[PDB]
Design an enzyme around this catalytic site. Structure first.
Site, PDB file in Angstrom:
ATOM      1  N   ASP A  49       0.858  -1.190   0.000  1.00 29.11           N
ATOM      2  CA  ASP A  49       0.000   0.000   0.000  1.00 29.11           C
ATOM      3  C   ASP A  49       0.889   1.233   0.000  1.00 29.11           C
ATOM      4  OD1 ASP A  49      -2.948   1.147   0.690  1.00 29.11           O
ATOM      5  OD2 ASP A  49      -1.529   2.236   1.879  1.00 29.11           O
ATOM      6  N   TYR A  54       2.861   9.847  -0.733  1.00 32.10           N
ATOM      7  CA  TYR A  54       3.943   9.334   0.093  1.00 32.10           C
ATOM      8  C   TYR A  54       5.291   9.552  -0.567  1.00 32.10           C
ATOM      9  CZ  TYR A  54       0.248   6.512   2.386  1.00 32.10           C
ATOM     10  OH  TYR A  54      -0.838   5.913   2.954  1.00 32.10           O
ATOM     11  N   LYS A  79      -3.103   5.783  -4.349  1.00 29.49           N
ATOM     12  CA  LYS A  79      -4.200   6.691  -4.028  1.00 29.49           C
ATOM     13  C   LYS A  79      -4.072   8.035  -4.714  1.00 29.49           C
ATOM     14  CE  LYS A  79      -3.925   4.795   0.749  1.00 29.49           C
ATOM     15  NZ  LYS A  79      -2.414   4.486   0.821  1.00 29.49           N
ATOM     16  N   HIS A 112      -7.881   9.557  -1.673  1.00 27.85           N
ATOM     17  CA  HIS A 112      -7.091   9.591  -0.408  1.00 27.85           C
ATOM     18  C   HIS A 112      -7.947  10.114   0.761  1.00 27.85           C
ATOM     19  CE1 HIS A 112      -2.543   9.370   0.956  1.00 27.85           C
ATOM     20  NE2 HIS A 112      -3.352   9.114   1.973  1.00 27.85           N
TER      21      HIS A 112
END
Length: 276
Positions: A49, A54, A79, A112
């Site tokens: 994930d 990120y 996401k 998200h």
């Protein structure tokens, strides 16, 4: 209920999502991401994930590639970031994710956060990408019951997953019950509360009894509640340890004692407060 790391839950469209995966939030791009991903996969993990935000999709991709397990046995989630919400910009953000991940399709793509008023448009875009065969499953992150209800008014496809903050300090009882009744699979972001329960006396006693670690107890608790779980871990020894949860079981009394730790306490933002 899983008996191993290979074990899966069927989403409403029939897609098999592994019950247990590697979350890579607050993991640094390049080698740190690549190295955690590779160690997870080597040690049997089948679900990773990540998210555009990120900043590690690139190291996630190289780790997938370098792991030497086949793409089709791997379940990759990313996401759409907040700033990218809207129909055309979501389509664009997805293609960017694929380019960074070095992937032809994703297994799961999530909105998200809900924010204020662009998520229905963003959902139409995931619907289109799903139709085009670019994504095996589609869903949402950090949606509350009211967001889901709003989305469901006009959705053609119901979200297949809702990935939310979930741990003994934030037990999400109304949301779990709601998603269950809607056939929306809950998934636990930051299931270890980012280490904040390490010394919790209730959990430590349960751990002692079972000869397990507090993290092992929490994750087993996720599984026994029927919540897919994606703990974060960088060190190979922690990666291995977190997953060693298939050889013990928590009694109903233990489960109930853990649920009693609830304080509606978040380490991530509240989706009703993070308004863009």
């Amino acid at each position: 209920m899983p008996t191993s790391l290979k074990d899966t839950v069927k989403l409403h469209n029939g897609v098999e999502m592994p019950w247990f995966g590697l979350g890579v939030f607050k993991v640094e791009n390049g080698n740190e991401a690549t190295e955690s991903v590779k160690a997870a996969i080597k040690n049997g993990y089948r679900s990773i994930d990540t998210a555009a935000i990120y900043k590690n999709e690139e190291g996630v991709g190289i780790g997938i590639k370098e792991s030497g397990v086949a793409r089709e046995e791997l379940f990759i989630t990313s996401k759409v970031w907040n700033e990218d919400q809207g129909y055309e910009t979501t389509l664009a953000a997805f293609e960017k994710s694929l380019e960074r991940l070095q992937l032809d399709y994703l297994d799961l793509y999530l909105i998200h956060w809900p924010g204020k008023d662009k998520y229905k448009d963003t959902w139409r875009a995931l619907e289109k990408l799903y139709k085009d065969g670019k994504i095996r499953a589609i869903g949402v992150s950090n949606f509350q019951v009211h967001h889901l209800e709003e989305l469901l008014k006009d959705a053609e496809i119901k979200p297949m997953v809702n990935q939310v903050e979930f741990h003994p300090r934030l037990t999400q009882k109304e949301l779990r019950d709601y998603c269950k009744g809607q056939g929306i699979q809950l998934e636990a972001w930051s299931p270890l509360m980012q280490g904040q329960l390490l010394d919790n006396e209730v959990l430590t006693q349960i751990a002692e009894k079972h000869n397990k670690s507090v993290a092992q107890v929490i994750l087993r608790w996720d599984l026994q509640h029927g919540v897919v779980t994606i703990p974060k871990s960088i060190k190979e020894h922690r990666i291995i340890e977190n997953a060693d949860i298939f050889d013990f079981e928590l009694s109903q009394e233990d489960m109930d004692k853990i649920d009693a730790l609830n304080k509606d306490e978040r380490v991530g933002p509240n989706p009703d407060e993070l308004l863009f």
